[PDB]
Amino acid sequence: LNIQGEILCGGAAADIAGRDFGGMNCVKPLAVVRPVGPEDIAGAVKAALRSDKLTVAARGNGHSINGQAMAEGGLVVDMSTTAENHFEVGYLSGGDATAFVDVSGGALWEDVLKRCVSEYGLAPRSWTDYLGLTVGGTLSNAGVSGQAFRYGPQTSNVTELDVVTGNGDVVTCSEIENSELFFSVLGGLGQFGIITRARVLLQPAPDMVRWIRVVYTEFDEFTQDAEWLVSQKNESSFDYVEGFVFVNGADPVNGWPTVPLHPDHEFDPTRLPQSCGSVLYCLELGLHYRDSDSNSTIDKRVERLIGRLRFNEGLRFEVDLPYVDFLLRVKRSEEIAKENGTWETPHPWLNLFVSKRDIGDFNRTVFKELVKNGVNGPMLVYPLLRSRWDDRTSVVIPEEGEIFYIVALLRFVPPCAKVSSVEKMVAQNQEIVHWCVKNGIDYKLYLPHYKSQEEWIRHFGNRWSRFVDRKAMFDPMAILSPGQKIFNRSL
């Protein structure tokens, strides 16, 4: 194959393309392709199509948990070498979003953020918690954070893509042009093509965020309050709503020390009622405001907005920081992980959506029993609104209810733990999924990983035939993102 970029066989390049953040799969490619642009990528795709066995996997920033960006004896396309290929801002008169920016599928969101803000005072309006992820990587899944209840996930905030299809075609698509490909690729787990450019929506960048954390002991009250907040009329409430479960104890990694937002206000556990469960709940809120706003005016606004919430008195923590610093807040957690050596150990992360109707049951068995001593990392749980998620996309969410929850068990492995430790974590993730399937819980995995056809058929449900149809159209040989394990390469 003749390309402008570099082709690397074996060595450190292959080692890296055979690793991901999951830290549980090592699958080496024949070669790593470092493309200059869409032509190098379609070349890689066409090479694989001519061969008997080659497959092609785009690699974003290697944040997958279960080998989804790996290609056993295939070609891994390191998208980072395309990270700077696009940066064009345009305006929108159609109301809603102010503007859009064209960015590479290989750009990291952290870089997109910094450049939009510094050059234009604009920024995307829907995020992930962690910004060391690629545009094409998150758009291939959903891209979820505390703004999604208001604007939908990142797949709801893109209006055009350039895609290199599994046929090797370079195609521009949108709601109006090649719409089937557009909707297929969004949330499509890399199955239908490689995103080389995305037109991402922009709004004016806020100056500041008031970041608030308040604590609940009662899951019913926590979820009622959170659902109420995400259901409020546009711009009458907060601009970010998340939640998390924490251990009722002093464990610095799992317990109440994880709650405070600055070193000068600590968690006082004597404010907790005597009857508290094994775990407690934190509602996390963000209010955007202007540099010019009077502090008393903002204080009064926040007291009004928080004033009906039923959190435990004396367990309210807040800080104010620039908007960019708020969006990059998880850098602090990355630093704690590198310090305790758990950034480089395996991460058997479990991510799923649960209907509003079943989140109570999930809390009862999962949070209050299975992981009641924590998982050594975040246990996130917060509500989302179905109205913001377009069902034409490949994304798969729970079957019933206008509100559903996202849940994340962000497991970390202490560096002196046995390999049996990681096995036990994986086994417990499986035990949770089984418990869901057995008890008819309306759940769907996010970043799903299954190895059997019957599990994928169950996952896609009434959208399985559509998924298969889209595959037959855009990657009939099944060469793309084989590590998702949904389709096996054609013989």
Ligand X SMILES: *Cc1cc2c(cc1C)nc1c(=O)[nH]c(=O)nc-1n2C[C@H](O)[C@H](O)[C@H](O)COP(=O)(O)OP(=O)(O)OC[C@H]1O[C@@H](n2cnc3c(N)ncnc32)[C@H](O)[C@@H]1O
Active site residues: 63, 129, 242
* Residue 68 counted as an annotated binding residue: yes
For ligand X, the binding residue among 25, 98, 126, 141 (CB under 6 A) is 141
> Is the CB of 120 or the CB of 343 nearer to ligand X?
343
Q: Is 203 annotated as a binding residue?
A: no
Determine if residue 61 is labeled as part of a ligand binding site: yes
Q: Candidates 55, 126, 140, 393: give the one binding ligand X (CB under 6 A).
A: 140
- Cβ of residue 196: shortest distance to ligand X, in angstroms? 7
How many of the chain's residues bind ligand X (CB under 6 A)? Answer: 35
Q: Which residue's entry shows tokens 């399985």?
A: 464
From the CB of 142, what's the least distance to ligand X, in Å? Answer: 6
The reply on whether position 363 binds ligand X by CB under 6 A is: no
Does position 33 interact with ligand X (CB under 6 A)? The reply is no
Q: Is 62 in the site for ligand X (CB under 6 A)?
A: yes
Does 342 contact ligand X by CB under 6 A?
no
61 contacts ligand X (rule: CB under 6 A): yes
Is 359 an interacting residue with respect to ligand X (CB under 6 A)? no
Q: How far apart are CA 343 and CA 41, in angstroms?
A: 31
* 3-state DSSP of the chain: CCCCCEEECCHHHHHHHCCCCCCCCCCCCCEEEECCCHHHHHHHHHHHHHCCCCCEEEECCCCCCCCCCCCCCCEEEEHHHHCCCCEEEEECCCCCCCEEEEEECCCEHHHHHHHHHHHHCEECCCCCCCCCCEHHHHHCCCCCCCCHHHHCCHHHCEEEEEEEECCCCEEEEECCCCHHHHHHHCCCCCCCEEEEEEEEEEEECCCEEEEEEEEECCHHHHHHHHHHHHCCCCCCCCCEEEEEEEECCCCCCCCHHHCCCCCCCCCCHHHCCCCCCCEEEEEEEEEEECCCCCHHHHHHHHHHHHCCCCCCCCCEEEEEEEHHHHHCCCHHHHHHHHHCCCCCCCCCCEEEEEEHHHHHHHHHHHHHHHCCCCCCCCEEEEEEEHHHCCCCCCCCCCCCCCEEEEEEECCCCCCCCCHHHHHHHHHHHHHHHHHHHHCCCCEEECCCCCCCHHHHHHHHHHHHHHHHHHHHHHCCCCCECHHHCCCCCCC
338 CB neighbour count, 10 Å cutoff: 11
- Which tokens is 297 given? 């005016």
Which part of the chain contacts ligand X (CB under 6 A), choosing from 44-52, 122-130, 363-371, 397-405? 122-130
Give the integer Cα–Cα distance in Å for 105 and 135.
5
Rounded to whole angstroms, how far apart are CA atoms 363 and 154? 27
Determine if residue 484 is labeled as part of a ligand binding site. yes
The answer to whether the annotation marks 191 as part of a ligand binding site is no
How far apart are alpha carbons 219 and 462 in whole angstroms?
Answer: 32
Q: Closest separation between CB of residue 244 and ligand X, Å?
A: 12
Q: Does 25 bind ligand X (CB under 6 A)?
A: no
Of 77-116, binders to ligand X (CB under 6 A) are 79, 105
Return the range that interacts with ligand X (CB under 6 A); candidates 117-125, 229-237, 412-420, 480-488. 480-488
Q: Output the smallest distance, CB 348 to ligand X, in A.
A: 12
CB closer to ligand X out of 21 and 228: 21
Please tell me whether residue 17 binds ligand X under the rule CB under 6 A.
no
CB of 156 to ligand X, least distance (A): 12
Indicate the residue among 98 and 167 with the shorter CB distance to ligand X: 167
Query: Within 144-163, which residues bind ligand X (CB under 6 A)?
Result: 144-145
- Asked whether residue 195 is marked as a ligand-binding residue, the answer is yes
Tell me: is residue 450 an annotated ligand-binding position. no
Q: Is residue 66 close enough to count as binding ligand X by CB under 6 A?
A: no
- With 0-12 / 13-18 / 19 or more C-beta atoms within 10 angstroms meaning exposed / middle / buried, residue 196 is buried
Stretch that binds ligand X, among 88-96, 124-132, 354-362, 386-394 (CB under 6 A): 124-132
Q: Which of residues 171-210 bind ligand X (CB under 6 A)?
A: 189-190, 194-195
Question: By C-beta, is 212 or 486 nearer to ligand X?
Answer: 486
Among positions 208-227, residues that touch ligand X (CB under 6 A) are: none
382 binds ligand X (CB under 6 A): no
Identify which range of 43-51, 141-149, 208-216, 300-308 contacts ligand X by CB under 6 A. 141-149
Contact status: 366 vs ligand X (CB under 6 A): no
Q: Is position 374 annotated in a ligand binding site?
A: no
Binding site residues, ligand X, CB under 6 A: 21, 57-64, 68-69, 79, 105, 128-130, 133-134, 136-138, 140-145, 189-190, 194-195, 447, 481, 483-484
Binding residues for FAD: 58, 60-62, 64, 68, 129, 134, 140, 144, 195, 446, 481, 484
